[PDB]
Design a protein around this ligand. Structure first.
Ligand SMILES: *[C@@H]1O[C@H](CO)[C@@H](O[C@@H]2O[C@H](CO)[C@@H](O)[C@H](O)[C@H]2NC(C)=O)[C@H](O)[C@H]1NC(C)=O
Ligand SMILES: *[C@@H]1O[C@H](CO)[C@@H](O[C@@H]2O[C@H](CO)[C@@H](O)[C@H](O)[C@H]2NC(C)=O)[C@H](O)[C@H]1NC(C)=O
Ligand SMILES: *[C@@H]1O[C@H](CO)[C@@H](O)[C@H](O)[C@H]1NC(C)=O
Ligand SMILES: *[C@@H]1O[C@H](CO)[C@@H](O)[C@H](O)[C@H]1NC(C)=O
Ligand SMILES: *[C@@H]1O[C@H](CO)[C@@H](O)[C@H](O)[C@H]1NC(C)=O
Lengths: 244, 240, 49, 49, 49, 49
């Protein structure tokens, strides 16, 4: 979040987070206005659940395209620099960063691509900076007749209006499937009860029932069993690795 | 040594038929006494596969990595060691390497100066330079039929394997054997071509014939059957 | 298709638009089953008579 | 009524709601057609008997 | 036409706008001003610079 | 463009063209163009929108 340098849109840095505790309480320590419009999940105290893997991506977006980063959206950079799938589930965090990126000397380190001749698939990385050719005549390293450079700098200056001010953003993406979870919220464990009608919570698998010993020949890679009706019939304890 | 040697004469590879091999557990969910229908990448039934013979005609050419590869080798004394992958197969770009030793396996993913015929005798005669290895992980050795299924979806490299002890000199036998998952390797880059390597006691010099088959996976729908136990005992290829 | 997950992942005014589809989808299945049973029962009564 | 325009003349992320209305509407209409035939077939079989 | 109107006024800065929200629970909200999920009415914030 | 008589600095022929089809490939023949800068729209794609 508070890195010294953030990479450009055309080359965003992707970061992998696993095997730890994700406390989501630190989001309210940064700048006051930090947009938290979430897809698929509700951040209003309902982020305390287990996920499988987490990918973090960061770049700097101008206000003319702040809302381009959204599923099923098109625009200048949505289809050319960063594409989000329609079925994307996750959260996008955005906040103003005029006090950092904008400088009196001049910030020209940020670029965005315009000439590609092809769209972007969800989560595509385009790093080539070759001169685009829009005509039959090869560019051969010179501009002019249907030969324009795809990479255009941003020219962030503080003088410019709030609309053109640079905002630092970050986007969080998760997945919640049958694979064992690696990142979990701050929940406290509790002892195991057997042969009693109690509630239970196994990494978000909330339910009600009676837990007993199971004779299932679970294989080491197998997490939980299922029955004919396609319902969770047996489970494995995350701590003692016991099949119930 | 891994310098330019042309001792092996190139010949068209033979072809053999894979009857009911190449079935793997597609999920961690445990089922018993049901028939479940799933859609996933699979080796089509009765699909013929390339046959390669190594030795002094060692057949170690480069082969494309086309959406998952089935691998098998009926050879004694585990002559084969490991596999390598990548796009340009040199230090210019990132590549993935998997090898094996007497008592473990070494998996790294970093730029290597691969020579023309990397092979393992030899100890580290497969490359000469290393840029920066983002992942590394050592576990127990995989160690006469040995089968392997390679899958690289969403950047998670997955390996399914099974060691079936048989003693014969024929082709792939008729029979069923579901492949169980072994590891999951998050690498995040793509692979187009791949190549194998073997333990050769290069210079007299110890040598022996080695064989290995290669088959490609396709998106199909299968109907796997689970018995009252945990095992998969039969399957049906829908579009055969 | 799991009710517990939907409740434990969405805020209350969000979940309503999600449970309603599930409830109506499942209510349709039960109504379909009963209608077929009523039709079959009438055929059986003809054979019983 | 034309579902092609819903994909194109209207944005992808919200179009799934409109498609759901069309899919649910037509699927129910198909269900109604079958139920009448089951009733009609019972009436015919009484005549055939 | 309404049965009654209840007005509550106090000095709250814009930083507390998101935490003191209709139906959105917060740490400060649980201890100072809690609103029901089904709150009916409107909230008006006025500048006092 | 191929007009021998051009307009003055403070008296420019503000010509409005409507109910027509616009082609920009034909005007690109001349190689003496020096500056070609577009604001708000791409240099390409102009035919479509
Ligand atoms: C893996 O990604 C690389 C991009 O860095 C691909 O390399 C190019 O891919 C395009 C699309 O097929 C080809 O037209 C180029 O010729 C490729 N360039 C080179 C130097 O190989 C690569 O094809 C991708 N691999 C797979 C299996 O999709
Ligand atoms: C299912 O698994 C059980 C393991 O608990 C098998 O039971 C044993 O099976 C082996 C050979 O299959 C026999 O030699 C043992 O005597 C069995 N022991 C017991 C206590 O049953 C069972 O046979 C398996 N079922 C199938 C169809 O293979
Ligand atoms: C800034 O970075 C430090 C690094 O540990 C972190 O503890 C702190 O919460 C961050 N503040 C933010 C993200 O507002
Ligand atoms: C493997 O099957 C293909 C599919 O038609 C066919 O060419 C032949 O039976 C086999 N290949 C060769 C090279 O004989
Ligand atoms: C693996 O086997 C090699 C034999 O070539 C040996 O030298 C090495 O010490 C072993 N262990 C590791 C971690 O390489």
């Amino acid at each position: 979040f508070n890195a010294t340098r953030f990479a450009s849109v055309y080359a965003w840095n992707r970061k992998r987070i696993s095997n730890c505790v994700a406390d989501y309480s630190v989001l309210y320590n940064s700048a006051s206005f930090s947009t938290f419009k979430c897809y698929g999940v509700s951040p209003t105290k309902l982020n305390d659940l287990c996920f499988t893997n987490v990918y973090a991506d960061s770049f700097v977006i101008r206000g003319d395209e702040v809302r381009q980063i959204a599923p099923g959206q098109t625009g200048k950079i949505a289809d050319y620099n960063y594409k989000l799938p329609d079925d994307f589930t996750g959260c996008v965090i955005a906040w103003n960063s005029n006090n950092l990126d904008s400088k009196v000397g001049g910030n020209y380190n940020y670029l965005y691509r315009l000439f590609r001749k092809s769209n972007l698939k969800p989560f595509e990385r385009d790093i080539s900076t070759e001169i685009y050719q829009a005509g039959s005549t090869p560019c051969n390293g010179v501009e002019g007749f249907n030969c324009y450079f795809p990479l255009q700098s941003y020219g962030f200056q503080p003088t410019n209006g709030v609309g053109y001010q640079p905002y630092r953003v970050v986007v969080l993406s998760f997945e919640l499937l049958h694979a064992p979870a690696t990142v979990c919220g701050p929940k406290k464990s509790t002892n195991l009860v057997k042969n009693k009608c109690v509630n239970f919570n196994f990494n978000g698998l909330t339910g009600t029932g009676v837990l007993t010993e199971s004779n299932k020949k679970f294989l080491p890679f197998q997490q939980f069993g299922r029955d004919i009706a396609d319902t969770t019939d047996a489970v494995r304890d995350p701590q003692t690795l016991e099949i119930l | 040594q891994c310098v330019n040697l042309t001792t092996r004469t190139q010949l068209p590879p033979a072809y053999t038929n894979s009857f009911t091999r190449g079935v793997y557990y597609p999920d961690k969910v445990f089922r018993s006494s049901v028939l479940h229908s799933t859609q996933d990448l699979f080796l089509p039934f009765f699909s013929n596969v390339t046959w390669f013979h190594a030795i002094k005609r060692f057949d170690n050419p480069v082969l494309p990595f086309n959406d998952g590869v089935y691998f098998a080798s009926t050879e004694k004394s585990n002559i084969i060691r490991g596999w390598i992958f990548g796009t340009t197969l040199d230090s210019k770009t990132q590549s993935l390497l998997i090898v094996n030793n007497a008592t473990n396996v070494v998996i790294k993913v970093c730029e290597f100066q691969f020579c023309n015929d990397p092979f393992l005798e030899s100890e580290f005669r497969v490359y000469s330079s290393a840029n920066n290895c983002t992942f590394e992980y050592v576990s127990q050795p995989f160690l006469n039929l040995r089968e392997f299924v390679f899958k690289n979806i969403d950047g998670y490299f997955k390996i399914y394997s099974k060691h079936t002890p048989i003693n014969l000199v024929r082709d792939l036998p008729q029979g069923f054997s579901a492949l169980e998952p072994l590891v999951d390797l998050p690498i995040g880059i793509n692979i187009t071509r791949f190549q194998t390597l073997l333990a050769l006691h290069r210079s007299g010099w110890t040598a022996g014939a080695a064989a290995y088959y290669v088959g490609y996976l396709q998106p199909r729908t299968f109907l796997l059957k689970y018995n009252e136990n945990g095992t998969i005992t039969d399957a049906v290829d829908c579009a055969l | 298709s799991v009710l517990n997950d939907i409740l434990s992942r969405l805020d209350p005014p969000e979940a309503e638009v999600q449970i309603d589809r599930l409830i109506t989808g499942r209510l349709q299945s039960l109504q379909t089953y009963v209608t077929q049973q009523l039709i079959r029962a009438a055929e059986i009564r003809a054979s019983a008579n």
